[PDB]
Nucleic acid binder design. Structure first.
Ligand SMILES: Nc1ncnc2c1ncn2[C@@H]1O[C@H](COP(=O)(O)OP(=O)(O)O)[C@@H](O)[C@H]1O
Lengths: 99, 461, 88, 114, 99, 99, 83, 109, 93
DNA sequence: AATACATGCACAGGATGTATATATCTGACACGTGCCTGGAGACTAGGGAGTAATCCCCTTGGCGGTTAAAACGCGGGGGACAGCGCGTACGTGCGTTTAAGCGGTGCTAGAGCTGTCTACGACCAATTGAGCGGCCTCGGCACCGGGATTCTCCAG
DNA sequence: CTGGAGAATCCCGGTGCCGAGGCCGCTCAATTGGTCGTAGACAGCTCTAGCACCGCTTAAACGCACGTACGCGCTGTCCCCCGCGTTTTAACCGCCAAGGGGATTACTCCCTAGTCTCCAGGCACGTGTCAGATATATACATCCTGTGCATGTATT
């Protein structure tokens, strides 16, 4: 073909699965999908940089769940932070209880 | 050696013989050229001892000054009265007040060297170190020599760097905690025989051996049972009070740490932050020190203010019991807010108080002590802070002393104890001291008892 | 005057009005109103609440109990106001 | 031996919908720390999943209120600006083709409004 | 006889010049420390402090309020006025990029 | 007879119309010539991917719209309706783009 | 082929549209040249910060990702263009 | 086996470069770090520190002092343009404010 | 215990610039924190450059463009001149 | 030949830069580790140069509208003027409470040991996610019609 | 003054009507999940001692309150001039199509360069110590406000 144009990996199908979860009868334009993909890349970059600086400041080298917990306590404001921490802790305890 | 009697330079002067023996000791120290520590019990004429020393000095050794005297500020007018009443020939000056009267005083009298002896409080010396470093001091006498307890305080430095000839010390309880108090005093008075604290520990039956190694070259220690023989020794009863229901629920409330109401939420408001033992001290004294223990207040002083802490319960039961006894009472509150609450309560029970808080000015202090010590006095209750009141005053009118709360140091408790036992008493020296149980206050008096025991083994000689 | 047990002056109002005046003349303003002080106390409480919340989060993560100077330098840096001097 | 058993992915093993393995790989290659804990990318993908769920809920609501069936950038802009904490999370972020929230100032309304 | 009262707007000028030519603190340290302890008590109870930490965020809050009063004075000068007002700091905090 | 509108209402018509819209208010080709004109003196003979020019038009449009919003806030606080260069100079001075 | 005077190509009704999106009713004269100066210095900043990215990457073509990164390091991040 | 020449003594620098290289490796910036990298980075840090301290020394010379206090370097950075633009959102502790009174607040009457 | 800092190098360049000029304790802490911040900002920018260009190392080119980014005009020009002079000194010797 | 307001000194006063002593405490420096940095080598893999495919940006051309440009007039907003009054600056007297210096605890930072299970790394399998293609439903567009706010006479 | 009638454009809404990007279905690959073997970051357990809290003491400078008075903020009027609204006239943006070459970009080999790893040693730090830069004090000349009034022109 045309050298099988390179695997530009992105977050399309996960955004689309979540969109089918909340509003199960609503599509999305492609530019809005690029917006959500750039958004989730930026937010992941923010939480990653925050947890990295936390683990640097405590003179450790292991980014584990506690540093992401305090990184999203720092980044997200208020009610968003509390709901996200509750959801992430539920996911981690489900994955640890069922591994 | 020297004067073998109550000497003649003192006017209206009745020196007791053991004070004259101590005077011979000081003049022998002066002949040997060694700074010493005169550290016997309080109420042994120690201010009269050094006044008699300078009365010997100016008369027969032709030393006209200067010899400064360091006191707490609650003793300035007392020392000046003793100088004006016993040895009047020394030119007597005193310095107190703000920078304006300080500048007036130095401009008048401290330039030419016209005086002979200058009593001066501590903080005045900290402010006028630049003045007093410009002199050639013969003597140096520090009344209540326990601001030099640590050798790192700025007063300890600024008294260590005096270009002077002789140093003399005057305290009641020369030991403070273990060895470093005597170490700092020895490194102050005769610094050229003392290098580190390990030398003092290596010199420290070894305890009594080091005790005599202090006692023979430079120390003097007595008690009124050795020399007076005309007075009751003490009269103490250690009474423990109950805990009120408000006291017990406040104790559990502060032990669960989750208490306050003064907002929309049930916060803590910093009151249980670190030092919970003194918070329990504040609780066991009275819950009303904390916020909102009284209701949303119209500020009246009910009997629920006095029936919500067992110290106050036994106290309200005992103040008419001492009124029918008919002698002057003496309360020593450590916490000044507890002194305020006792002020409100004795106003409610309508006795005459004179509050010695420690922030009162000196002009409203000495006259208060005089009105308490007037012939056939009237001021029944006498409220003092333990530190600034019971540090150096003389209160031989009363006989019953109410030690409200013994602090962490037992020797300042002994000082406020024997304030009433100064020259002895015509009556016996009753002690009604309070203690609450189920708290840290028993640990307080227990550590004070261990400190008093390790002080006792060396203070018997 | 007042009666005994004098506990008063709620702690935000402890930031006194000549202190805000001194901050104003430090900021270089000739004349203040009479309403600047209350909203200034509100602004300062908001700002300190944000910064202290971040520093308390930091010190909670390090499992300590004492807020250091380093925690409030990291908190202020994470807000966009890098403080030189203290710590580092 | 079962050298390859039933390959149960971690997104289905955390009860999630986001690529736990891809987040783990992007944390490893991302030069963030030396080692990356095993409980970390599950937490990170769960947090990203919840944030995306919130933004899509509000964008779908604002798009259904405009009767359309596809979320366009305008619906994302109105969703993120008509919420306080998402506005504070995105206080610097401009989005493309987003438009502005409709807001005329009250003073510029015409006089004798009645 | 006839005491020398300074005109309104002279002691203000000398106060501005004296406080701008200095660099010490302006808020008194013990009320600020108790205020910081009451703010920090809300988030978590048993909090000690560094005793340089409170000086650090005292310098922070001082720099923040000095910048706020500076551009407040700027916009109040802009409104054909000298006195600052609540709408001055409200406009300054709005277009500054804050809440 | 030629029925007119009162001065001040067609502007409100345009405000509602443009805040309802989400297009590019500046045309694209003179903007592209502008970007090439000021990139002509940084590195000569560059090429633009034209998604770059779309991104620049979106960025400068959002920046200028936020600037005019805060300038309008300024000239309303200064008891006016019209905006003038002192307002936008104050907006950039307070916001910090201008020193 | 250097271009000359394209900043005055940003016409007056385009600035009026850009303003009337922002919510301003009356717009005085001589706000226009100030808006030209503001726009010119802002995108001079972002064009320098994009050209530096491109010249580090050893290209001759300014991509959209260089513009996105140059806006990102200015604290003015732009979504949508494949961030 | 020979004499140990520090690379800062071979770069003509005054900043260390072994510490800078150890910081670049341990700081988790990239998995590999070049050998021109710590030399260049310490050169830029040395030029920036010389650039600040020359102006701060001039400012301490204006106030008739040998020592350099935070007021001196704060006035030096906020008085200069480029260092101000580098340190815009940066609050120097113990620094004070550069003197500026707006001209409509002077009396001038 | 052991805690590294840029104290003595700041003192060295201070004595090199002004041969008779002291410096405080807190001015030393300020200069140390300033150097820490600037080095951290340049190293983070070079890391992001290496991630953007798909690379995995940091040579002098990445930090030279990070200095091109972070600094304003003449400061960036003189820092680039100083860095290139120092790396030519290091390579040639 | 005394009034009216203005301009300007005089001088009374108050702050303030400055001259000079000096007390100190705190930065400069000297030393004794020791731990980190350098010397020195093996290496492998990440970068570096080459190479063809190809998408993809740049020019050119046309044309058809849509927007910009220019013009008028006027109406309403910006700006100066002025009147007032009350709200804030300033000086002073009391008072309180911060501040520096006390004692006096003990919680908790912090350094060190030490054992494991945490993740790293590698192998091998196998499948989920990116790409390509097709297709058709949501949406943009366009007519067109019916409501919906606005402006002006004009009869209240 | 003034509601309101009614033109009267503006705009919403409805009903087609194309059309072309979501949207799903193969496809096949790089990637990820399972196994397992090492190793060493961190959890956890010591001590320990540093400094943080906490109240008292004592000075003394700032905070609070009040008085007074006046100067600036606010309102209100006028005016004038200058941007808004509309009409008419250009002009150049945009749409469409096509070509052209050029940067780019994924694949290939190869080769130096940073990593890993011992082995030694000397520069950086901690601790201690001391002298001089400056913080403080006091005194005195030197400026800045202020305003009272003498008069410098106007008014009468
Ligand atoms: N010769 C004497 N005659 C009568 N009273 C004396 C005589 N000597 C001493 N006293 C009393 O004994 C008291 C001892 O006080 P003292 O303990 O010296 O005070 P401080 O505790 O300051 O040293 C004096 O106040 C004095 O009244």
């Amino acid at each position: 073909k045309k050298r099988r144009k390179t695997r530009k990996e992105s977050y399309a199908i996960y955004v689309y699965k979540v969109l089918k979860q909340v509003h199960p009868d609503t599509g999305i334009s492609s530019k809005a999908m690029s917006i959500m993909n750039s958004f989730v890349n930026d937010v992941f970059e923010r939480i990653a940089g925050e947890a990295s600086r936390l683990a640097h400041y405590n003179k450790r080298s292991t980014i584990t769940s506690r540093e992401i917990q305090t990184a999203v306590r720092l980044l997200l404001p208020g009610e968003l932070a509390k709901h996200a921490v509750s959801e992430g802790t539920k996911a981690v305890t489900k994955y640890t209880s069922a591994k | 050696t020297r004067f073998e009697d109550s000497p003649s330079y003192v006017k209206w002067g009745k020196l007791r013989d053991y004070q004259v023996r101590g005077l011979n000791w000081l003049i022998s120290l002066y002949e040997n050229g060694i700074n010493g520590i005169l550290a016997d019990e309080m109420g042994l004429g120690k201010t009269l001892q050094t006044i008699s020393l300078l009365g010997y000095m100016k008369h027969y050794r032709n030393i006209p000054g200067p010899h400064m005297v360091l006191v707490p500020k609650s003793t300035l007018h007392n020392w000046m009265s003793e100088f004006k009443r016993w040895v009047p020939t020394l030119r007597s000056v005193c310095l107190i007040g703000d920078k304006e009267q300080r500048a007036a005083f130095v401009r008048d009298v401290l330039l030419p060297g016209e005086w002979d002896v200058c009593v001066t409080s501590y903080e005045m010396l900290i402010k006028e170190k630049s003045v007093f470093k410009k002199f050639n001091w013969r003597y140096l006498v520090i009344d209540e020599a326990h601001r030099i307890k640590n050798e790192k305080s700025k007063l300890s430095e600024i008294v260590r760097e005096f270009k002077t000839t002789n140093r003399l010390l005057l305290t009641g309880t020369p030991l403070q905690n273990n060895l470093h108090e005597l170490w700092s005093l020895l490194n102050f008075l005769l610094p050229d025989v003392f290098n580190s604290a390990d030398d003092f520990d290596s010199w420290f039956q070894k305890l009594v051996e080091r005790l005599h190694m202090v006692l023979r070259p430079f120390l003097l220690r007595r008690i009124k049972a050795d020399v007076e023989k005309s007075l009751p020794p003490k009269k103490e009863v250690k009474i423990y009070v109950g805990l009120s229901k408000m006291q017990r629920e406040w104790y559990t409330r502060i032990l669960m740490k989750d208490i306050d109401i003064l907002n929309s939420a049930g916060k803590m408001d910093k009151m249980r932050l670190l030092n919970i033992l003194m918070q329990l001290r504040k609780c066991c004294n009275h819950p009303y020190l904390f916020d909102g223990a009284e209701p949303g207040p119209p500020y009246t002083t009910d009997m629920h203010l006095v029936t919500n802490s067992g110290k106050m319960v036994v106290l309200d039961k005992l103040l008419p019991k001492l009124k029918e006894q008919g002698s002057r009472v003496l309360i020593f509150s450590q916490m000044t807010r507890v002194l305020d609450i006792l002020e409100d309560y004795c106003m409610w029970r309508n006795y005459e108080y004179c509050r010695l808080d420690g922030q009162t000015p000196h002009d409203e202090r000495q006259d208060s002590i005089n009105a308490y010590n007037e012939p056939n006095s009237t001021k029944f209750v006498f409220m003092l802070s333990t530190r600034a009141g019971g540090l150096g005053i003389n209160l031989a009118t009363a006989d019953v002393v109410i030690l409200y709360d013994s602090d962490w140091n037992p020797q300042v408790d002994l000082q406020a104890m024997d304030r009433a036992h100064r020259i002895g008493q015509t009556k016996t020296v009753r002690v009604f001291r309070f203690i609450t149980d189920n708290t840290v206050e028993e640990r307080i008096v227990e550590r004070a008892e261990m400190k008093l025991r390790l002080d006792s083994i060396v203070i018997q000689q | 005057a007042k009666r005994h047990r004098k506990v008063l002056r709620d702690n935000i109002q402890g930031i006194t009005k000549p202190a805000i005046r001194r901050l104003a003349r430090r900021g270089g303003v000739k004349r203040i109103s009479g309403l600047i002080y209350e909203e200034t106390r509100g602004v300062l409480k908001v700002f300190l609440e944000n910064v202290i919340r971040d520093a308390v989060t930091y010190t909670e993560h390090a499992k300590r109990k004492t807020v250091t100077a380093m925690d409030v330098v990291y908190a202020l840096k994470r807000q966009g106001r890098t403080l030189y001097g203290f710590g580092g | 031996g079962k050298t390859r058993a039933k390959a149960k992915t971690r997104s289905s093993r955390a009860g999630l919908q986001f690529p736990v393995g891809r987040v783990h790989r992007l944390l490893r290659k991302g030069n963030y720390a030396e080692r990356v804990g095993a409980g970390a990318p599950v937490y990170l993908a769960a947090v990203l999943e919840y944030l995306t769920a919130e933004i899509l809920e509000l964008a779908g609501n604002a798009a259904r209120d405009n009767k359309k069936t596809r979320i366009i950038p305008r619906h994302l802009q109105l969703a993120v600006r008509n919420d306080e904490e998402l506005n504070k999370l995105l206080g610097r972020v401009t989005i493309a083709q987003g438009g502005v929230l409709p807001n005329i100032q009250s003073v510029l309304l015409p006089k004798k409004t009645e | 006889k006839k005491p020398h009262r300074y005109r309104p707007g002279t002691v203000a000028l000398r106060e501005i010049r004296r406080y701008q030519k200095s660099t010490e603190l302006l808020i008194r340290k013990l009320p600020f420390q108790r205020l910081v302890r009451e703010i920090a008590q809300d988030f978590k109870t048993d909090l000690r402090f560094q005793s340089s930490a409170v000086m650090a965020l005292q310098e922070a809050s001082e720099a923040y309020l000095v910048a706020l009063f500076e551009d407040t004075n700027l916009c109040a000068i802009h409104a054909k006025r000298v006195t600052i007002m609540p709408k001055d700091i409200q406009l300054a905090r709005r277009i500054r990029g804050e809440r």
